[PDB]
């Protein structure tokens, strides 16, 4: 067979925790600087 | 007997425990100290004034810490396949109730920061919506608990 | 869930607030009618005191005159602007960038119709407004030929982008200055338009039909304003912009014009210029065109003013409290020529 | 036997490689030289 | 003088809770010694013989209480001394 | 009615219910009482830094604050993560255990926890000084100590609610406006009693009645409550809690059910009759009423359900208290002779100097603000309309 | 654009090879061996248990933060020239955080029937178990995403309400009943969830 | 076009400003030409600094 | 008697066809919402006379719940696979429908709004719009219904 | 002598029969009413003259539910796979069609309806259009009875 | 007795507590040179008050270092599964909070460098931020630390 | 990662050295090094078609 059933638990977990993992890399990964200082 | 891969999930659990919440943590820091720049050169006195959201960030990853530990002393060599969800379960739930809560205080401390920058008056109010941040942190810790029994 | 409207406080929600706040500051109909019966410039400042304008004139002008008026309502203008820009991140940046650089342009064209006459040299620093500047704002009085000019604004002024390949000229007269004017323009009209619908969401249906109004508004002008003139025909079709709802005959009926009544007859095509056209009957009593004009693009901005996430709430209300500030002076005007007949003349706002 | 657990590590392994290397070399390939002396200026 | 009080009175703060949660520790573990319900850890592998080892070793962990107080017992000494220096 | 006597000692109680702990009510007082002593210095003196002021404005919170913390850590019997154990347990005693058929089992237990079921017959007892204290070390700690905070939890927040909401019919008489009492707070109380009480008695029911020998086929109130809430009557599966369930929670929810058209529909009908009799947009009258009421039934389940953050504070509270005792001094126990207070020196001072830095500061400044939050939201939304001026006197500055 | 190229990427490369894997089994009288019944069954349903369990509160809990920050960013913006706006906006977040209480409810009347077994193939682990375990996660998953949309709308309707309230003061009184009728459906989402994980008796 | 040359030096005490009166930086510089041409035009710029 | 795993169509047909009316519904009001509040601002006096949209927003969501309760009424842990089939068929059909409803209301009633706001005539043909958007949505729900009842 | 899963495809087929179809008509109705609305502002009177893509959509929504009844009517326990994959084949091209129909009626009536406010010479010119927009859908009513009796 | 697949988790572990470390230094000390760059001018004689987020860095990069080196150190051929678990937990867990880690010190270390330029009492403050973000960092390393043995 | 590095800079130094002689000899001395970049990637290769 192509797949255990162990394999496909781990699987389907690492593929949720990825996930959230890529949505908060998104948006931190989204982060700007200021160009100039008031005053 | 038990398989062989049940060990992997529940220790997989602690991970989140110390990765995504500490993620939500330090993107709360990063945001709160651009905040300090645009108000430093005009108003200069309250520079400590401001030390309240920067902290109120570290306690997200203080609250993860002491999840992860507990996740390190449940682990032993013959776990059955329910402790290893539940301890996953627990670490996914913390994990992610962190960094949710810490998006929520980044932005509010920028805002924060910007808004008392021109109307001291504002201070007060600021705060109030900061401490509906830092508590739904604890949510998520809550069924961590619950998990380590049922 | 629409498409724009989830992620756009969460580096511009802040800066919303403020401009949504100091929208307020635009005075109604009843305070303008309170305000047009001041007896005095101080009975004006009196009044301005109890507004939200309240507190600039706490200087020493004693002898009290419309310059200091003046000044520090621009004064007031460029220092919230400043700080409104000094607070925002990139894309917004650029957006309050594509706003200021119509001011640079202006005052630009300023310096360098100024420079044509020698009889001033320096003194025109505190004409050109304060907004416009940039590091090069001196550079103009170099320039003997507009390659020198170009020379000049290459570096660091980003009007380059406008007219680097739209103007090849070697002599500098005091014709061709008009054209500068029309091309730079028209490049920045164009070039805001395209930005604008990049942008995409709310804000490119909140303001694209500011910005087609623009353009029609400045076709028209220029057409009337060469009837009578030196201005060859191509060149005028070669200044239109192409971003309005007259572009078949825009470059087909009114290159063939010559007299206001075949401009009358493209105008009533359309029913909204034919009602501003007829409006505007150039009679001895009625308003010329411009003021029609003028009324129609306060109507716009403000008509513009109900939507939630468009990033244009700060770029038409620069303009609008422009507006305001060319009224106050009119009222003021009156009372420095002792007569209220001609009071009226405002235009309300809000 | 274990042809599932040969399968998957080299499937998740070579995954891994490529699209980092993609990801990676679409970062350099789009990279900015400046517009800003050297290149802005002309005649 | 030297080490006003403006960045000591603290130091002495800290010294007398010590001094005070040190000598409550050190009396609770040699009095009561410290039933295992106010404490967990012990010092030794071994206990299958009997009773007099469990009291002899919580004896000598809370004679470790010593040195411990009597540290601070100096330092709020030094302090105070330090604070009257003006 | 000025809110101020009921707050004034309902707020130190509320941080007290999510403030149980005893060392760090002693430290919190001793830090008001430095600050009290020194009134008339401070007073009389050039200060800069806000914080200091606002602290020093709020003195008098603090104070009680810290004073019925002090009460409430020693109910809770967790003063610095352990328990003061007076020594009166009554659990387990070994002839009494070799009684029940339990002998040199320790030998498989060295690496196994053995759980011992309840009840051998020869063991029980109560504590008068609060909570008994062997739980500080049991590994089943967490169940119980979380099903007594939900219970508690819920159970104040419904004592609370209904001081909260008792009290506008004073008001109601004393502004002389029957419409608004008779047709008003009449259905608004029986609704929510009928509602809530009914959980109130379940509850002490259930802790007074089942006794430990009918362990298994005891209830869930939960389920009890959800049943009667989808009205489904299932024959098996769960066993009604007491004779003549039925008829009387078949009642309750009908009752329950009938008081809302009186508030949707009823006054409104009788404005207008009235407003004829003379002879006033009727439309909008029963449109704003009938706003009002579902917003008042939606909102109170809401302030129900939101009682909750007291038994998070509480368990978060016992938790950090637990890691910060037992991960960095927990090594202060040690095999050294002569250098090891020396090494506990540093260690205390780090341990003192955290604990400073994380629970008293700033998850304290949370929880009053939670306290707050619930003094304002889920109190004062059911009589303080809150529409009113102070005086702006023309004393001169 | 900047980079969810990525994203689509990954999106249509994935369901491609779902498309031509699937088409290869059918026409290879290949589909004895895709069987459904194997992945349902011999996975336990701990696993989707706790799943369940888990969701129930995530998606709650990223639904309030969305509302919160949404709100908070606003208001505080607004209030910079208008004070007197502070305080009275407070109920959006009461709201806000109210789907948070309603999950983290649920969360603790699913948490209940986790009895452990001891079955091994699936015949042993029986019907009634595979019955609650798949029940249970969906309720966890419907909870979890209606109290994640509901919080997302109040947000954004109290921050319209929160940024038009600075203007004119007499205004608040008129647009809370688009709150009520958001957050009606964070409510109707628990009670679904409830309606589904009724008869559960795992053992 | 480089046909002038430029040299820089700058005084670390920053100097009094006439008008303000704040210490604002201040710097000294030299420049060599070849001709008048350059004399005569090298003062619009100058003028503008 | 049926196999083992008869019950997970069933059930995610039912949490798909709450969820999803759930999430039109949000989006309906949501929109209506900032359409309602950008508008209060210039003729505030007619704010009543505006809120019709939120209330048909409001009907999607009853569709989706009488679905979902009419659908976990009829689960049993032993039906056969045809009926958990047309579970699940219904359940998404009425889902679908409702998102899609959803959508349409929320635009309508945004544009509707300002339109209002311009000009009071336009009232009435706002409603009849209104009512062609309500009926699509309805229309599922009777298809659904000849689907659970089969 | 016939499995049962073999009556999943046919379900399906009800769903799409009405969700792809439903799709469209709310899409339409969308792009109607920012046309509509912007109409109104200057000549009201026009409003009851603008009102027929509309109806037309509506009819585009009715053809989907008639033959998502039909084909749910047609269902039974005891299907071979023959019948569910015509049923499945019927609702996806009923399905789509009603959904490109409802597309290219939604983008017409937003131009024509704009366009109509200056020229009025242009209405009947438009409903020409329509109905050259209207009978795709209709096609794709053919191809499902020919499907369902067979 | 146990597979040899075991070893994979572990080393991989061994791998990455190293890798995603050094990514985070890759970011304290590059944007906070950038920053320092503009920081030379206006003022060149505070580069010892803006030398310090390049010192985080390597200090992060040393704490990637250690539990790179511990884990790598209990390397065996027969290790047993649990044990490999164990440690690729641990150097996942450890890699990403110092990844997190160094995102943050980089993005306050540019903000708080020009903010000193401009304002110099900044400077004593901004180091309390800096501050907060190596706590995160001490934190990752805790957990290896209770991984190890336990 | 040869080819890109020779692009880029290339580009900017043919760009820069259009009007400053000087920087010509200087570019090559950094094209050296990319050579020798790619130099290492065929070493390595090398070893392990023997290997």
């Given at each position: 067979?192509?797949?255990?059933?162990?394999?496909?638990?781990g699987?389907?977990?690492?593929?949720?925790?990825?996930?959230?993992?890529?949505?908060?890399?998104?948006?931190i990964?989204?982060?700007?600087?200021?160009?100039?200082?008031?005053? | 007997?038990?398989?062989?891969?049940?060990?992997?999930?529940?220790?997989?659990?602690?991970?989140?425990?110390?990765?995504?919440?500490?993620?939500?943590?330090a993107?709360?820091?990063?945001?709160?100290?651009?905040?300090?720049?645009?108000?430093?050169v005009?108003?200069?006195?309250?520079?400590?004034?401001?030390?309240?959201?920067?902290?109120?960030?570290?306690?997200?990853?203080?609250?993860?810490?002491?999840?992860?530990?507990?996740?390190?002393?449940?682990?032993?060599?013959?776990?059955?396949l329910?402790?290893?969800?539940?301890?996953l379960?627990?670490?996914?739930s913390?994990?992610?109730?962190?960094?949710?809560?810490?998006?929520?205080?980044?932005?509010?401390?920028?805002?924060?920061?910007?808004?008392?920058?021109?109307?001291?008056?504002?201070?007060?109010?600021?705060?109030?919506?900061?401490?509906?941040?830092?508590?739904?942190?604890?949510?998520?810790?809550?069924?961590?608990?619950?998990?380590?029994?049922? | 869930?629409?498409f724009?409207?989830?992620?756009?406080?969460?580096?511009?929600?802040?800066?919303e607030?403020?401009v949504?706040?100091?929208?307020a500051?635009?005075?109604?109909?009843a305070?303008?009618?309170?305000?047009?019966?001041?007896?005095?410039?101080e009975?004006?400042?009196?009044?301005?005191?109890?507004?939200?304008?309240?507190?600039?004139?706490?200087?020493?002008?004693?002898?009290?005159?419309?310059?200091?008026?003046?000044?520090?309502?621009?004064?007031?203008?460029?220092?919230?602007?400043?700080?409104?820009?000094?607070?925002?991140?990139?894309?917004?940046?650029?957006?309050?960038?594509?706003?200021?650089?119509?001011?640079?342009?202006?005052?630009?064209?300023?310096?360098?119709?100024?420079?044509?006459?020698?009889?001033?040299?320096?003194?025109?620093?505190?004409?050109?407004?304060?907004?416009?500047?940039?590091?090069?704002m001196?550079?103009?009085?170099?320039?003997?030929?507009?390659?020198?000019?170009?020379?000049?604004?290459?570096?660091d002024?980003?009007?380059?982008?406008?007219?680097?390949?739209?103007?090849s000229?070697?002599?500098?007269?005091?014709?061709?200055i008009?054209?500068?004017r029309?091309?730079?323009?028209?490049?920045?009209?164009?070039?805001?338009?395209?930005?604008?619908?990049?942008?995409?969401?709310?804000?490119?249906?909140?303001?694209?039909?500011?910005?087609?109004?623009?353009?029609?508004?400045?076709?028209?002008?220029?057409?009337?304003?060469?009837?009578?003139?030196?201005?060859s025909?191509?060149?005028?079709?070669?200044?239109?912009?192409?971003?309005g709802?007259?572009?078949?005959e825009?470059?087909?009926?009114?290159?063939?014009?010559?007299?206001?009544?075949?401009?009358?007859?493209?105008?009533?095509?359309y029913?909204?210029?034919?009602?501003?056209?007829?409006?505007?009957?150039?009679?001895?009593?009625?308003?010329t065109?411009?003021?029609?004009?003028?009324?129609?693009?306060?109507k716009?901005?403000?008509?513009?003013?109900?939507?939630?996430?468009?990033?244009?709430?700060?770029?038409?209300?620069?303009?609008?409290?422009?507006?305001?500030?060319?009224?106050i002076?009119w009222?003021?005007?009156?009372?420095?020529?002792?007569?209220?007949?001609?009071?009226?003349?405002?235009?309300?706002?809000? | 036997?274990?042809?599932?657990?040969?399968?998957?590590?080299?499937?998740?392994?070579?995954?891994?490689?490529?699209?980092?290397?993609?990801?990676?070399?679409?970062?350099?390939?789009?990279?900015?030289?400046?517009?800003?002396?050297?290149?802005?200026?002309?005649? | 003088?030297?080490?006003?009080?403006?960045?000591?009175?603290?130091?002495?703060?800290?010294?007398?809770?010590?001094?005070?949660?040190?000598?409550?520790?050190?009396?609770?573990?040699?009095?009561?010694?410290?039933?295992?319900?106010?404490?967990?850890?012990?010092?030794?592998?071994?206990?299958?013989?009997?009773?007099?080892?469990?009291?002899?070793?919580?004896?000598?962990?809370?004679?470790?209480?010593?040195?411990?107080?009597?540290?601070?017992?100096?330092?709020?000494?030094?302090?105070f001394?330090?604070?009257?220096?003006? | 009615?000025?809110?101020?006597?009921?707050?004034?000692?309902?707020?130190?109680?509320?941080?007290?219910?999510?403030?149980?702990?005893?060392?760090?009510?002693?430290?919190?007082?001793?830090?008001?009482?430095?600050?009290?002593?020194?009134?008339?210095?401070?007073?009389?003196?050039?200060?800069?830094?806000?914080?200091?002021?606002?602290?020093?404005?709020?003195?008098?919170?603090?104070?009680?604050?810290?004073?019925?913390?002090?009460?409430?850590?020693?109910?809770?019997?967790?003063?610095?993560?352990?328990?003061?154990?007076?020594?009166?347990?009554?659990?387990?005693?070994?002839?009494?255990?070799?009684?029940?058929?339990?002998?040199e089992?320790?030998?498989?237990?060295?690496?196994?926890?053995?759980?011992?079921?309840?009840?051998?017959?020869?063991?029980?007892?109560?504590?008068?000084?609060?909570?008994?204290?062997?739980?500080?070390?049991?590994?089943?700690?967490?169940?119980?100590?979380?099903?007594?905070?939900?219970?508690?939890?819920?159970?104040?927040?419904?004592?609370?609610?209904?001081?909260?909401?008792?009290?506008?019919?004073?008001?109601?008489?004393?502004?002389?406006?029957?419409?608004?009492?008779?047709?008003?707070?009449?259905?608004?109380?029986?609704?929510?009693?009928?509602?809530?009480?009914?959980?109130?008695?379940?509850?002490?029911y259930?802790?007074?009645?089942?006794?430990?020998?009918?362990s298994?086929?005891a209830?869930?109130?939960?389920?009890?409550?959800?049943?009667?809430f989808?009205?489904?009557?299932?024959?098996?599966?769960?066993?009604?809690?007491?004779?003549?369930?039925?008829?009387?929670?078949?009642?309750?929810?009908?009752?329950?059910?009938?008081?809302?058209?009186?508030?949707?529909?009823?006054?409104?009908?009788?404005?207008?009759?009235?407003?004829?009799?003379?002879?006033?947009?009727?439309?909008?009258?029963?449109?704003?009423?009938?706003?009002?009421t579902?917003?008042?039934?939606?909102?109170?389940?809401?302030?129900?359900?939101?009682?909750?953050?007291?038994?998070?504070?509480?368990?978060?509270?016992?938790?950090?208290?637990?890691?910060?005792?037992?991960?960095?001094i927990?090594?202060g126990?040690?095999?050294?002779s002569?250098?090891?207070?020396?090494?506990?020196?540093?260690?205390?001072?780090?341990?003192?100097?955290?604990?400073?830095?994380?629970?008293?500061?700033?998850?304290?400044?949370?929880?009053?603000?939670?306290?707050?939050?619930l003094?304002?939201?889920?109190?004062?939304?059911?009589?303080?309309?809150?529409?009113?001026?102070?005086?702006?006197?023309?004393?001169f500055? | 654009?900047?980079?969810?190229?990525?994203?689509?990427?990954?999106?249509?490369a994935?369901?491609?090879?779902?498309?031509?894997?699937?088409?290869?089994?059918?026409?290879?009288?290949?589909?004895?061996?895709?069987?459904?019944?194997?992945?349902?069954?011999?996975?336990?349903?701990?696993?989707?248990?706790?799943?369940?369990?888990?969701?129930?509160?995530?998606?709650?809990?990223?639904?309030?933060?969305?509302?919160?920050?949404?709100?908070?960013?606003?208001?505080?913006?607004?209030?910079?020239?208008?004070?007197?706006?502070?305080?009275?906006?407070?109920?959006?977040?009461?709201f806000?955080?109210?789907?948070?209480?309603?999950?983290?409810?649920?969360?603790?009347?699913?948490?209940?029937?986790?009895?452990?077994?001891?079955?091994?193939?699936?015949?042993?682990?029986?019907?009634?178990?595979?019955?609650?375990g798949?029940?249970?996660?969906?309720?966890?998953?419907?909870?979890?995403?209606?109290?994640?949309?509901?919080?997302?709308?109040?947000?954004?309707?109290?921050?319209?309400?929160?940024?038009?309230?600075?203007?004119?003061?007499?205004?608040?009184?008129?647009?809370?009943?688009?709150?009520?009728?958001?957050?009606?459906?964070?409510?109707?989402?628990?009670?679904?969830?409830?309606?589904?994980?009724?008869?559960?008796?795992?053992? | 076009?480089?046909?002038?040359?430029?040299?820089?030096?700058?005084?670390?005490?920053?100097?009094?400003?006439?008008?303000?009166?704040?210490?604002?930086?201040?710097?000294?510089?030299?420049?060599?030409?070849?001709?008048?041409?350059?004399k005569?035009?090298?003062?619009?710029?100058?003028?503008?600094?």
């Open positions: 067979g192509f797949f255990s059933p162990g394999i496909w638990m699987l389907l977990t690492t593929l949720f925790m990825l996930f959230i993992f890529t949505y908060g890399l998104h948006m990964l989204s982060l700007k600087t200021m160009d100039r200082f008031d005053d | 007997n038990n398989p062989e891969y049940s060990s992997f999930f529940g220790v997989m659990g602690a991970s989140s425990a110390m990765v995504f919440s500490a993620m939500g943590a993107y709360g820091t990063a945001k709160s100290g651009t905040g300090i720049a645009a108000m430093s005009m108003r200069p006195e309250l520079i400590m004034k401001s030390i309240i959201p920067v902290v109120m960030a570290g306690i997200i990853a203080i609250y993860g810490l002491v999840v992860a530990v507990l996740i390190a002393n449940s682990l032993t060599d013959g776990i059955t329910y402790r290893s969800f539940l301890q379960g627990a670490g996914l913390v994990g992610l109730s962190g960094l949710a809560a810490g998006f929520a205080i980044g932005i509010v401390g920028d805002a924060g920061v910007r808004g008392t920058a021109q109307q001291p008056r504002l201070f007060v109010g600021m705060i109030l919506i900061l401490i509906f941040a830092e508590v739904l942190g604890l949510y998520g810790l809550i069924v961590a608990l619950i998990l380590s029994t049922k | 869930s629409f724009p409207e989830l992620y756009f406080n969460v580096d511009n929600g802040y800066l607030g403020l949504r706040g100091l929208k500051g635009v005075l109604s109909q305070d303008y009618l309170n305000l047009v019966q001041c007896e005095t410039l009975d004006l400042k009196l009044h301005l005191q109890s507004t939200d304008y309240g507190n600039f004139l706490a200087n020493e002008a004693s002898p009290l005159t419309v310059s200091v008026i003046d000044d520090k309502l621009k004064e007031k203008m460029v220092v919230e602007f400043r700080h409104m820009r000094n607070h925002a991140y990139e894309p917004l940046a650029s957006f309050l960038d594509f706003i200021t650089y119509s001011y640079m342009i202006d005052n630009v064209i300023l310096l360098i119709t100024g420079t044509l006459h020698q009889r001033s040299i320096a003194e025109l620093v505190p004409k050109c407004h304060p907004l416009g500047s940039f590091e090069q001196e550079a103009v009085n170099i320039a003997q030929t507009p390659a020198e000019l170009y020379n000049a604004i290459l570096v002024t980003p009007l380059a982008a406008f007219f680097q390949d739209c103007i000229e070697q002599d500098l007269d005091e014709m061709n008009e054209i500068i029309n091309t730079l323009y028209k490049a920045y009209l164009e070039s805001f338009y395209k930005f604008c619908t990049l942008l995409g969401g709310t804000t490119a249906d909140a303001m694209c039909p500011i910005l087609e109004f623009e353009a029609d508004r400045r076709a028209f002008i220029i057409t009337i304003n060469s009837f009578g003139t030196e201005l025909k191509e060149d005028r079709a070669k200044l239109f912009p192409h971003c709802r007259l572009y078949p825009g470059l087909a009926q009114l290159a063939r014009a010559d007299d206001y009544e075949q401009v009358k007859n493209v105008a009533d095509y029913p909204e210029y034919k009602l501003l056209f007829e409006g505007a009957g150039s009679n001895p009593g009625d308003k065109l411009e003021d029609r004009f003028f009324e129609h693009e306060v716009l901005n403000k008509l513009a003013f109900l939507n939630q996430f468009h990033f244009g709430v700060f770029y038409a209300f620069v303009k609008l409290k422009e507006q305001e500030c060319r009224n002076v009222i003021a005007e009156c009372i420095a020529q002792r007569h209220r007949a001609k009071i009226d003349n405002y235009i309300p706002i809000f | 036997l274990e042809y599932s657990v040969v399968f998957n590590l080299v499937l998740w392994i070579m995954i891994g490689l490529a699209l980092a290397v993609i990801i990676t070399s679409y970062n350099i390939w789009n990279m900015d030289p400046g517009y800003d002396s050297i290149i802005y200026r002309m005649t | 003088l030297c080490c006003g009080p403006k960045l000591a009175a603290c130091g002495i703060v800290l010294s007398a809770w010590g001094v005070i949660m040190l000598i409550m520790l050190g009396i609770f573990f040699n009095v009561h010694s410290a039933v295992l319900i106010e404490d967990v850890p012990f010092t030794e592998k071994d206990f299958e013989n009997g009773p007099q080892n469990i009291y002899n070793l919580y004896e000598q962990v809370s004679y470790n209480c010593f040195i411990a107080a009597g540290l601070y017992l100096l330092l709020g000494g030094f302090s001394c330090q604070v009257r220096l003006n | 009615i000025n809110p101020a006597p009921y707050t004034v000692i309902t707020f130190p109680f509320l941080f007290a219910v999510m403030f149980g702990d005893f060392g760090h009510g002693i430290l919190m007082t001793l830090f008001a009482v430095w600050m009290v002593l020194r009134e008339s210095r401070i007073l009389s003196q050039k200060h800069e830094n806000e914080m200091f002021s606002m602290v020093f404005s709020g003195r008098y919170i603090i104070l009680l604050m810290g004073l019925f913390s002090i009460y409430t850590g020693l109910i809770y019997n967790d003063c610095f993560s352990k328990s003061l154990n007076i020594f009166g347990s009554s659990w387990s005693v070994r002839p009494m255990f070799t009684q029940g058929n339990w002998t089992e320790t030998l498989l237990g060295s690496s196994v926890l053995q759980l011992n079921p309840a009840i051998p017959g020869v063991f029980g007892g109560p504590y008068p000084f609060g909570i008994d204290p062997i739980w500080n070390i049991a590994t089943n700690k967490l169940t119980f100590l979380n099903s007594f905070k939900m219970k508690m939890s819920v159970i104040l927040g419904i004592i609370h609610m209904l001081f909260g909401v008792s009290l506008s019919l004073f008001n109601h008489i004393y502004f002389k406006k029957p419409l608004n009492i008779y047709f008003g707070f009449i259905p608004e109380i029986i609704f929510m009693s009928s509602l809530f009480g009914y959980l109130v008695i379940l509850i002490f259930k802790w007074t009645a089942y006794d430990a020998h009918s298994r086929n209830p869930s109130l939960l389920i009890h409550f959800i049943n009667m989808l009205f489904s009557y299932p024959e098996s599966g769960n066993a009604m809690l007491y004779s003549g369930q039925k008829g009387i929670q078949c009642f309750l929810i009908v009752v329950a059910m009938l008081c809302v058209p009186w508030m949707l529909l009823f006054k409104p009908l009788i404005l207008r009759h009235q407003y004829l009799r003379k002879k006033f947009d009727f439309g909008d009258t029963m449109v704003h009423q009938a706003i009002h579902i917003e008042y039934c939606l909102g109170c389940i809401s302030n129900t359900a939101s009682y909750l953050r007291l038994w998070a504070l509480s368990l978060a509270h016992a938790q950090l208290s637990e890691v910060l005792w037992t991960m960095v927990h090594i126990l040690h095999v050294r002569l250098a090891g207070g020396l090494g506990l020196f540093f260690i205390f001072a780090a341990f003192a100097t955290l604990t400073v830095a994380i629970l008293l500061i700033m998850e304290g400044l949370s929880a009053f603000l939670h306290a707050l939050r003094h304002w939201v889920e109190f004062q939304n059911k009589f303080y309309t809150g529409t009113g001026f102070k005086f702006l006197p023309f004393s500055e | 654009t900047g980079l969810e190229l990525l994203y689509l990427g990954i999106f249509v994935f369901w491609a090879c779902m498309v031509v894997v699937g088409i290869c089994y059918t026409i290879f009288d290949l589909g004895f061996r895709f069987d459904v019944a194997w992945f349902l069954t011999e996975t336990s349903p701990f696993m989707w248990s706790n799943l369940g369990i888990g969701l129930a509160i995530s998606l709650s809990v990223v639904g309030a933060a969305w509302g919160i920050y949404i709100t908070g960013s606003s208001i505080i913006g607004g209030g910079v020239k208008a004070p007197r706006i502070k305080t009275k906006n407070l109920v959006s977040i009461i806000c955080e109210a789907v948070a209480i309603y999950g983290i409810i649920m969360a603790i009347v699913i948490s209940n029937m986790a009895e452990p077994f001891s079955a091994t193939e699936p015949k042993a682990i029986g019907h009634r178990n595979y019955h609650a798949y029940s249970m996660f969906g309720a966890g998953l419907t909870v979890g995403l209606s109290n994640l949309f509901c919080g997302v709308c109040v947000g954004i309707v109290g921050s319209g309400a929160a940024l038009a309230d600075a203007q004119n003061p007499s205004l608040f009184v008129k647009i809370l009943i688009v709150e009520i009728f958001g957050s009606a459906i964070g409510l109707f989402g628990v009670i679904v969830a409830i309606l589904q994980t009724s008869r559960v008796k795992m053992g | 076009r480089g046909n002038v040359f430029l040299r820089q030096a700058e005084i670390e005490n920053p100097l009094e400003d006439p008008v303000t009166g704040d210490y604002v930086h201040k710097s000294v510089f030299i420049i060599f030409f070849q001709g008048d041409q350059l005569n035009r090298v003062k619009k710029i100058c003028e503008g600094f």
